[PDB]
Every structure is written in C-alpha cells, then in structure tokens.
Amino acid sequence: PKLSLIKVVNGCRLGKIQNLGKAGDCTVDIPGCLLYTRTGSAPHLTHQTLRNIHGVPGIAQLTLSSLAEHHEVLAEYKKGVGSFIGMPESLFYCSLHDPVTPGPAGYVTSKSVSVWGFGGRVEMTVSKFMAIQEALQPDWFQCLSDGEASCAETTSIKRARKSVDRSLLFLDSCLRLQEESEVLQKSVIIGVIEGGDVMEERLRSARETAKRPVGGFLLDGFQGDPAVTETRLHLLSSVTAELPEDKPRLICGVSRPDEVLECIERGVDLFESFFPYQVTERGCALTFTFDCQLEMTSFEINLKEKKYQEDFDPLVRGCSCYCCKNHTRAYIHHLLMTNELLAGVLLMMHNFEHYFGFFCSIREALKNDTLAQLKELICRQM
C-alpha cells in the first residue's frame, strides 16, 4: 500500500493510497470511508441499486461476524469473496466484528476469538482465522486481535496490558501463517492497536505493532456512546503520534460526522459508514448541510412524523440521489406507515449518498484549508 500525502493541515492527512487491488490499479482517497456491508451486501441495496448512488467508495468493508459461518462454502468456491458476492471490481477490507451487531463480550482468550453471525457463534483460533481469510481472499483484513479491554465496565490495568500482549501474539502468529500460503500473501494484514484506556499500554501497542511489516493500522477500542470521550480522544492522539506517516490509519465504531472530524484531526484516515445505515433503520433521513461556500440526532429528520404526510418536497433539495430526484417525503412517510421495504431502500440510497458527499466536503475543505468552518458548521447542528 503506497500512501502519498498531499499535505497535513492542522493534523489532518490529505492524500491518496495508490496501487491497490489484484491488478494494483485502484486508489483510495484519504480521509475517506468504506462501503458498509452485511453478509457481503450493502444493506437494502442490491448491486443494481448500488449503482444508482454517486460517490460509492472503491473499498468496501466486510465483517467476519457475517461471513465466518460461510467458510466451507467459500472454500469450495475458491475464487474469493468479492467474486462470490458479485462485486469482483471492488476492494475489500475484512474486519473482525460488525460495528452495529458485534455480539457479547467475554469470548476472547489467548487461544481463540469468537464472532457472531445469523447462524450463531463461530470460534476461531489463529489457524481457523487464517483459514477463513484464505477462502475470502480480501484485499485487506484486520488481524485477529483482543479489543475487549476497551469496554464500558471498570477495566483493569492488567487487562489492558493483556490485550497488547495477546494481540501481538496473534499478530506474529498470523504473519508466520501468511508467509506459508501462496494465496494469503496476496492479502494485506492490518495491525490492531489495543491497550484499553491505559496510556502506557496504548503507546506500547502502537510502538510494538509498528515494528511489524503490517500494511496499515486499525485503531480499536475508541468507540463512544454518544461519541468518543475526551479521554479516548486524547489517547487516540498519543497513539497516532507513534505510527508511521506512510501507512493508513483505520478506526472502527466511529462514523458520526462530529467524531469523524474529531478523529481526522488526530490523524485517522479511513472510517466505517455504518452511521447512515443506523439512520435508515429508524426511518430517518440525513439532512445536515455541509456546504462551506454560500436515538435520533439533529443531523436527520424522522419521516414517520405526521408533518410529512403531505410534504411533497424531496428529502433534501438539490440532492442528486435516486430518492430525492424521483420521490417525495410524503411517499417515504407512506412507505414507513405501511411497513414497506422500499422505504429502507430509498432511505439507504439517500443516506449513503448524503454521507459520501459529506466525505467529499472533508477532502474539499482540506484542499482549501477550511476544515474549521466545516467542523463548526457540523457542530452548530449538534
């Protein structure tokens, strides 16, 4: 992964990651987001509706928690997961857990980690994990790691120290297995920075993982309800200060626009796009503006509300997505009252398109050195 930075304005890395994919003819702009999927499909959207969206990222996120139970099927398929799900043209980064439905904690030992899918729990040793990545053949994949020291409950220093040692032991095991397979060497391993909420362990995880020949870094354990806390925001800064500038920085569980801008300032490049999915699932549409040249959040409207029963305007005036060019709020409101699946389809198209256009404004603002105005415009809308 040859990463090239255009500039670093106020700690924000503007650049592009070149020569990606099997043919090495793909690029990814940073900062950016990945296409969110579930069982290898964008939620509510087939490959046909997915083409109706402008600005779809070139790299899509897969989750082992949705694909691990299909290990035997993909092994017999042999041709890789991207071809199996009918998206051979896209890049794929396979993460360990789904950010919205991760499953319960307490199944991490120094011998195995468990993920959770529709069929149930899948227990993966390092052998089993690399055997599954061999069938998936993703472009990138998160290395098996221990991220359960970062939890809401009172966590211990010994537990934070364990997550660093356990993830490193996992990392070194996966690297030894990777070099023993022709297929697996085509994929890129992503180191995972752990350490819980203990500063010494966070910094030790960042330095020790950077010593490995990983192609990038996943910043794990910084999720926050309702958003990333000030304590973990400072932890994130200290970690990224220990990482090379020439490798991408990914983060999981951070998708809301306010905390995205907060983490870009800390030097984080790539984000998951599960926030527009969450907005869709509650029957809402993102309406927050990001133009800098002129359970539900304030960035959205709830179309189950009776005030849209006669509202014949689009979700967002001037939006170029399929829903806003062809349908009205009243139609979306009607589909939600009659529990029709077209509501989830039309809402997801807009919420993805609006979200992807938000990431265009971030890269545009970094070109013009105006992320301050953009951050204040996003935050003034809470």
């Binding site: 579930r38 069982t39 290898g40 499909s41 964008a42 939620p43 509510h44 959207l45 087939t46 490959h47 046909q48 509706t49 109706n52 949705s66 299909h70 099927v73 017999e76 398929y77 199996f84 799900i85 009918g86 899918g117 529709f118 069929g119 029963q309 006669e310 014949f312 399929y322 062809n326 349908h327 009205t328 009243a330 139609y331 009607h334 589909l335 009252m337 009659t338 529990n339 029709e340 699946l341 077209l342 989830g344 389809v345 039309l346």
Partner: protein
C-alpha cells in the same frame, strides 16, 4: 374506439398476440400484470420494474383507501405521480367483514363506529382520483344457492351504474367483470347481459375460489367463447406458469396474481422446471445462476449459493433479488408465449413448455391435458 389490436392468432387454438393502446403507453398482450403495491412493499424501485420490461402493474384500491387515502393521492397528482410510475396502472373497484346491499358494499369500523358505504358511484370516483389507465367495475362477489344468481344480476345493475358515473371514458378504461361462479347457466346469462354494454374491456371473475380445475378451465373457455374478439379478456387471480399457458390457449389476454411476489418471500425462485427452493441445503454450494437464460439482474450477476447465503442472514436484499427474478420469469414466459403466436408455433411451444415442466406427458396435470386438447393442442 377499440383499445386492443390483434396482431397474430394461433391457427389451431385460441391464442392471441395483441397490443393495448393505453394513455401511459402500449402494452403487448398476452401480459401478466404484477401487483405494484406488493412490489414496492418488496423493495423494488420504479426503475427496476421498468428495466424488467413491465409496462403495466396493479394497484390495490382498498389498500390505497386505507393509506394514504384518495384525497392524498389526488394531491399527489394521482397514483402515477405518487409512486412515480411512468407506465400503465390498473386498479380494482375496492369491493373485495363486508355486508352488501343494493346501495353498495358496507364496511364496519373496528370496535363499533360509523360504517362506510362503497357504492358503484363512489368506486368510480375513488378510482378516478387514483388516475389508473384501466378501472374495474364494482361487483357483488359471493363466496351457493339463490345468492349466486342474486349477486350476478346486481353486478349487472352495478355495471350500468359504474358506466353512468364514469364521465371520462377517454382517460380511464372501465372493465366489466363476468360473474355466475361455476354455474354455466348463470355465467352465460351474465355474458349475454354484460357484452351489450359499451365497455372497452372484459374481465372474468370468480375463478380463483378453490374450485376444481375441471370446472375452472371450463368456465374460462365458456367466458372466452362469448366475449368480444376485438376487446381484451382479463382473467383475474391466475399466476401459475401452467395456468397462464393454458388460459392463453383458451383466449385470455391479461392476467394478474400476487403469486410471483409471494413465493419470493418464501425463498423460492421460478424456473422452467418449476421452482428452486433456494433456502434449502442443496443450493449452499450451487455456484450457477438461477437460470442462465434469464435476463434479470439477479441471474446476470448472482449465484444460487450466494442467494442461499443471504436467505440465511438478516439481509432484506435476499427478498429483493428473488422478487426481481420472479417478476422477470413471468414477463419472460408471457413474451415467449407471444413470440410463439407471432411465429405460428404456439402448439409446439406448449408441448415443449409442458415437457420441460412435467417430463413425460402422462405426468402432466389431467385438467391441463383436457383444456389444451379442447383447443387442438395434443401432447
């Protein structure tokens, strides 16, 4: 002012290749008409349904009467503008607890409350607000004795009242619905009375009630033998592939059924050999498409094995893929039927369809062998 042009006929049976001239475009016949109300509920956009070649679909008058109501549909520039459907639409009368009097159909309110009277006049007014290209008369549908004949004559009187209330025949086409149930004498009477009315089209009602298949196709053939040759024949509630092929041979032109949308939710995908139950274990490693001959987006992109994976997950897209394909199967079948009529090879087409569906002709359904033989198609 005929709305149907006959393009080709089978020189051996009653099959008709035709074309409907409707305000939102022309429709090739024979045509299966999906229920668009269930399609959108299935998660299929207008662009997808259009890309499948569908040029006419149904809307449910009673459902739209409950939500969002005809007042909002009017404000939304009719049903076309509401769902943004550019092609043709057909709506039912809205009649089918419900008591029936000469005034109309009576709807009770749950847990007491004011009733709602749906007269023939109000059915036309409601359907006029929806703006569909074809509208259906209000009829008196019964579930056997004096009530069958009583309801048939009321359906005739209600037909005259719908014709009088329908003041814009240039913008909406009103269809009569043949009643009589399975009684040949009553159905023949209703055919005699209703064909005297100047309606652009005719529909065959009361033939999806659980009757025997022998009485089914015989009531179809009795209807098509007395319906005008220069107007379309609409058989309601018929969607199974065999029934379509057989009833085209009996002279029907239009069909509707919730069947393709329904089984898509059950994991089943329609194929020339019947259906594939893609939720079952046997398709977990089947890396072929549903049908390599199907042009739909699902069959051009995805395998049975991947759809099997989606069916064993929380992904709603599993239903979208199958709903797309099943509708495409219905359209592909009826267009292949139409090509065989244009190319004067309809009986050979029927023999090949039956052979692929059932195998040896002795395994074909007995009712279908009799119905096809009645119009000169042997197996």
């Amino acid at each position: 002012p005929r709305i149907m042009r006959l393009v080709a006929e089978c020189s051996r049976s009653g099959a008709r290749a035709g074309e409907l001239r409707l305000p939102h475009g022309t429709v090739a016949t024979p045509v299966f008409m999906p229920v668009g109300t269930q399609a959108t509920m299935k998660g299929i956009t207008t662009e997808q349904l259009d890309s499948l070649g569908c040029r006419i679909c149904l809307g449910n008058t009673y459902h739209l009467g409950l939500r969002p109501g005809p007042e909002l549909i009017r404000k939304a520039q009719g049903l076309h503008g509401f769902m943004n459907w550019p092609h043709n639409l057909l709506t039912d009368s809205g009649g089918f607890l419900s008591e029936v009097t000469e005034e109309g159909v009576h709807f009770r309110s749950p847990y007491d409350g004011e009733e709602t009277l749906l007269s023939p006049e109000r059915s036309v007014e409601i359907q006029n607000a929806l703006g569909s290209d074809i509208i259906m008369q209000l009829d008196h549908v019964v579930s056997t004795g004096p009530l069958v004949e009583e309801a048939m004559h009321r359906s005739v009187r209600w037909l005259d009242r719908c014709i009088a209330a329908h003041k814009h025949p240039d913008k909406q086409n009103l269809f009569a619905i043949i009643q009589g149930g399975l009684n040949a004498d009553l159905r023949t009477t209703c055919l005699k009375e209703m064909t005297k009315r100047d309606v652009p089209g005719f529909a065959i009602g009361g033939l999806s009630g659980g009757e025997s298949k022998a009485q089914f196709w015989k009531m179809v053939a009795l209807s098509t033998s007395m319906l005008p040759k220069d107007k379309p024949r609409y058989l309601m509630g018929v969607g199974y592939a065999t029934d379509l092929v057989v009833c085209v041979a009996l002279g029907c032109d239009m069909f509707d059924c919730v069947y393709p949308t329904r089984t898509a939710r059950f994991g089943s995908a329609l194929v020339p050999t019947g259906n594939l139950q893609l939720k079952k274990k046997q398709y977990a490693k089947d890396f072929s498409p549903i049908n390599p001959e199907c042009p739909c987006p699902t069959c051009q992109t995805h395998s049975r094995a991947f759809l099997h994976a989606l069916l064993h997950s929380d992904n709603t897209t599993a239903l979208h893929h199958l709903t797309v394909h099943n509708i495409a199967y219905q359209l592909q079948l009826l267009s292949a039927v139409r090509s065989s009529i244009l190319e004067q090879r309809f009986p050979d087409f029927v023999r090949n369809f039956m052979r692929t569906m059932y195998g040896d002709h002795s395994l074909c359904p007995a009712w279908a062998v009799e119905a096809l033989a009645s119009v000169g198609i042997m197996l």
